[PDB]
Amino acid sequence: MDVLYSLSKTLKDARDKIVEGTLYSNVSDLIQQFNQMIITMNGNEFQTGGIGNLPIRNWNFDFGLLGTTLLNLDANYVETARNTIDYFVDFVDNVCMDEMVRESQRNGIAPQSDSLIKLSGIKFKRINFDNSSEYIENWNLQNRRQRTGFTFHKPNIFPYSASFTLNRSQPAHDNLMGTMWLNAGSEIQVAGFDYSCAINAPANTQQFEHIVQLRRVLTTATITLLPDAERFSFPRVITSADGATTWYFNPVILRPNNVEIEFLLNGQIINTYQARFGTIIARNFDTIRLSFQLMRPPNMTPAVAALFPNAQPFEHHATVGLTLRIESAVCESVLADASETMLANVTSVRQEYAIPVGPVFPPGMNWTDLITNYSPSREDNLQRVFTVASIRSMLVK
Amino acid sequence: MDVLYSLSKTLKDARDKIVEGTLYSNVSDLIQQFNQMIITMNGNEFQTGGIGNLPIRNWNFDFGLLGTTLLNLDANYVETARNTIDYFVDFVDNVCMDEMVRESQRNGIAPQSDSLIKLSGIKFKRINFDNSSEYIENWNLQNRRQRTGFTFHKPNIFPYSASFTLNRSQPAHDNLMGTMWLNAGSEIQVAGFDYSCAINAPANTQQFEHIVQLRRVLTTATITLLPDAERFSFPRVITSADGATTWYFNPVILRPNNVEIEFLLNGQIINTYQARFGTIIARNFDTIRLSFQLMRPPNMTPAVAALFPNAQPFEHHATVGLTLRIESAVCESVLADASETMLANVTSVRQEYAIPVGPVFPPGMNWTDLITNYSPSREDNLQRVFTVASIRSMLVK
Amino acid sequence: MDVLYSLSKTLKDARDKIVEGTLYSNVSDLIQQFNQMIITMNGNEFQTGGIGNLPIRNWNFDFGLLGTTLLNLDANYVETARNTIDYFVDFVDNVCMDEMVRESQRNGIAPQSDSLIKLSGIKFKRINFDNSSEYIENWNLQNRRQRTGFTFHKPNIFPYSASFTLNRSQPAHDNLMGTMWLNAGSEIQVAGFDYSCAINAPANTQQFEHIVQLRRVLTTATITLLPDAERFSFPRVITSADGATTWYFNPVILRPNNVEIEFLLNGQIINTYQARFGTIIARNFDTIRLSFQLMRPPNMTPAVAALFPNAQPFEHHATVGLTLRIESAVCESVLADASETMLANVTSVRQEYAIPVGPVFPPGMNWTDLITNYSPSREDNLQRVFTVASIRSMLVK
Ligand SMILES: [Ca+2]
Ligand SMILES: [Ca+2]
Ligand SMILES: [Ca+2]
Ligand SMILES: [Ca+2]
Ligand SMILES: [Cl-]
Ligand SMILES: [Zn+2]
């Protein structure tokens, strides 16, 4: 993997650096590395493709070195360099694509592709240079078994699920207290509702909890908590848990009470925030538990009093909601995120060449399926593909 | 354009690299390039400005080289270097600003500015070095007619439009089925509504479609699909298509049914997703067609049954909605996006110097106007300004 | 601060660059800098920690140089290098953490930590190299008193506040016109409501204003304006300004009228946008004033007419709303933002070692408290911690 990165990294620098009219000193070190790459590559045959719709290509390297005598580079020098760069960029691109579409249950980390396997051989190690990328650096650390972290803006950590639970239920479905939620992407929305409005409830208060457990630990996250949920604040007709019938939800929205958010790792509270809205920091967590309460208003003006009356039927149902978004976090595992293009790159290559379903990855490379049962085997496989995708993007965007 | 980039790129590196107490070896290659820039620049006169409120400046270069003999740099060396760097940073800044405010219908790609025209002359080519930026690299590829892509987080691709269509209409405006939408930025929201609730409708089902066509093709995009639209879920009084009268919309929200999203390029479906929510990938597309259906509930509890009754008047109107956001994509054309600062930079310079309206660009450099009729002429002009803006930001943020 | 940056910067490059099998030419300049760092460091003792729960560590440097004779690096060379790199990475990490947790009212900019104070001494200046980071570059400019800017995606500029004002009020709280808002993060939402619907109002029109004043000036921002506010579009029971009673808000939503947004700096309008939605640019501002009007519909279909009737009670209350998000801006002061991880890093270190409350910073390092009274003293302190946090992230993520 490291060797493949360097081939790309060199080719990229060669493209940026070798420009007509530039001083030789600017590119002298680069010319040496580029040449060393040609010497190592030369005389080897590489075969890629033949899986799915991906064509089989044979790659042959027999190139001359670049000159080291000009003071400033010229159009001639640049043209010669380009021909070598082009053939090389194409090979790397293909080697990457071939890697991207494979997976192994037993040894996910090891390179699947024949071309990648050949490179990881001893002779080629010379090509290796300058592994400064966030993905390569992380790749290097993992082999040494050191700590690593990827930084995500809007981490994609919550598999999509929308649901509700009815804490008190009737067939009439006319006097219900339950929470409903959406967890999608980096955003959690939780709503607690009482049809009664807690007129019965001891202390006149109703207590709701949502607990969300993440697949992977997150560190140094930045999050926003907002009182209320926009999503669950409008009237809906809702299909039913059994699936038999449909209830009706009509809400009136009251400020949540006695809110707490707890961020827990192994069930020790690490961070706890009470009645705090806006940006908050959770340093380390694997679970979030949100607690909020519905409190009946002790004093009501006349219009309010009409809304909540002492016995059914109740027209308007009291709801309290929270919204939590993780803006950025750090993970020790790769995840899809808003900014990065890796899931998109891997998914697209697989889609285009009609790769058949593979044991390691859910069909279509669906994120929700993948994040839902994100096993160690999947994690190994995901990183190897992601790194190659990153490598590929250096050259082919 | 390439020469201008290097002037900037050198000046930037000179600022980062030439610091007091540093080893000469660290900056030796840089000193050579910096000096070469001084030799090339020296003896030339450049004139900029005089368009709008932008002042006319005359630029004269007569500077000595930097020394190459110290072991570690010192306060003296740094002070001398700074004076040259300052004059140079100012010139570049101005040359850029002068470029930013001009445009041509006939030859948008070619540099408009007198200063930029002079630089693109043969002698100056020597200054050229190290074109590694995403904007410069893309600039280089386009001249060679190779494939290019810019990567956007939250691409700004949908011109702002909010509208509705009434599929069934009455002057009473009391029994209406129609879709309403918002397309803004990277976000599409579509809502389908039936006042009847489809009690009449064949199969008890009502089918809605929204088709959105983008101005430019997008590749390897990451998108979120969420059932329901928050925007169209609350009651509104709406002005009317003729503009004569106003209707009333009151919605009750039901899960959309038989949802499909299709991503099409030249009217071949490239990607199709059915009943899938959360993150999905569209590898290549120029059109999105969203299809969803409204299905009357076969079974209704008593409160639900009250909501939809067999003949008018109907108090509550059934609605089904979708939300689609493109988190990140790749385009072969420049676009405004959430992260980048180029539209802001170009627009601000034009605003500040009171540049008169130009044929190529809509007045005020408005994005919606620009994206709405994003012609080849505009695209050429947009990139040249954007690259200069990027160049300028290296030095002047 | 500059010296600390370089120690880190060197160590980072040493980790990326010194890899087995690489050509010596690739790392020769680096080896020279790395060695120079060892020579400067050697023979000095540094003590860190002892504040809060942070352990006291003693640091001793006595290391040999790296060899300069191999053609390509080998496993041996790499292993030797790593041992030096490790001890060094640990020290830097600790020096940073020690810096992060301190603050001074009197001299915020100067380094608080004993280790940092020792480094800023004359002998160590030699280590200094290559200050190219956005944070370090900004640090350098500020000392020279030059202009600086940080670029934020989703700047965190509005302290969280949710409120309302009642322009016309009754104890009944049954005929009210008032605005309500949320300002959180980079997002401003404003809603104007009339229970009457302006049937009384002169010209049949009702005019609302929201004025928001930011703590720091912002330049070249990109913003989205959307008609309507999702947040205030659903019915709520609201506690009351006195806190005594609760009113009831039920809204019907009408398009805002005669919208203007003004961006002002020192109370001169810099940018003014009328009836413009979608992306707009504000080049320079310290205040936003949003103006919108509620206009009674001259023509109403029968269902609409029912909604607004001539005398109380009024069931449905007319509302008009605006949403404004700043996607990206530039500030001359550091701010928390969606992408960056600095507030999270500083906050987490303080949380973990149980640092006692400090005079400069609000307890818990809360952003809303900090942004609300963002004094010059806080700003000085915030930057020094932020730069160290950035430095630390180079090495320890
Ligand atoms: Ca765990
Ligand atoms: Ca309602
Ligand atoms: Ca097309
Ligand atoms: Ca000011
Ligand atoms: Cl975002
Ligand atoms: Zn973002």
Residue numbers in the entry:
A (entry chain A), B (entry chain A), C (entry chain A): 1 to 397
What do the study's own words say?
In this study, we used a K2 Summit direct detector (Gatan, Inc., Pleasanton, CA) to collect a single particle data set of rotavirus double-layered particle (DLP) and estimate the critical exposure of a non-crystalline specimen. Rotavirus DLP is a spherical particle with a diameter of about 700 Å and a molecular mass of about 70 MDa. The capsid has icosahedral symmetry and consists predominantly of viral proteins VP2 and VP6, forming an inner and outer layer, respectively. VP6 assembles into 260 trimers that arrange in a T = 13 surface lattice containing a total of 780 VP6 monomers.
The T = 13 lattice enables 13-fold averaging of density in addition to the 60-fold icosahedral symmetry. The large size of DLP and its high symmetry make it an ideal specimen for this study, yielding high-contrast particles with very low-alignment errors and almost a thousand averaged subunits per particle. At the estimated resolution of 2.6 Å, atomic model building is possible and an atomic model obtained by refinement of a previously published structure agrees well with the starting model as indicated by an RMSD of 0.4 Å. Calculating the Fourier Shell Correlation (FSC) between the VP6 map and the refined atomic model demonstrated a resolution of ∼2.7 Å. One possibility for the difference between this and the ∼2.6 Å obtained with the half map is the absence of full density for the most radiation-sensitive side chains in the map, while they are present in the model. As expected, the density of side chains fades with increasing exposure and dose deposited on the sample. The density of carboxyl groups (e.g., Asp29) fades most rapidly and is already partially gone after an exposure of about 3 e−/Å2, while those of aromatic groups (e.g., Tyr24) persists even after an exposure of about 35–40 e−/Å2. We note also that the density of the α-helix backbone remains visible even after an exposure of ∼50 e−/Å2. The two reconstructions are nearly identical as judged by the FSC and are both of better quality than a reconstruction using the unfiltered sum of frames 4–130, suggesting that the exposure filter is weighting correctly.
